[PDB]
């Protein structure tokens, strides 16, 4: 999920937008 | 510079990029 | 949650949203 | 500049993109 993608790893703007709404 | 987005910093990043879309979890 | 983006946090926000565009200052 | 807009105040994605490149 978001934690693995953006906290443990580094995530892009596009990935992060996946998690909006 | 730390590029990881954790906790409150992850919340701010979502504030920033979700804009009027919003995101979970904002009660 | 702090929505201000200062110092290193501002650098990360630019990393995040500038993507392959880049930004000053990355020597 | 960016500090006044995004650090002192709160800036939007659109404002922040102003400062890329």
UniProtKB/Swiss-Prot annotation, chains A, D:
Disulfide feature: 6-11
Top-level taxon: Eukaryota
Protein name: Insulin A chain
Organism classification: Eukaryota, Metazoa, Chordata, Craniata, Vertebrata
Part of the whole protein covered: 90 to 110 of 110
């Amino acid at each position: 999920g978001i934690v693995e993608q953006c906290c443990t790893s580094i995530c892009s703007l596009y990935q992060l937008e996946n998690y909006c709404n | 510079v730390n590029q990881h987005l954790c906790g409150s910093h992850l919340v701010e990043a979502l504030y920033l990029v979700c804009g009027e879309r919003g995101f979970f979890y904002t009660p």
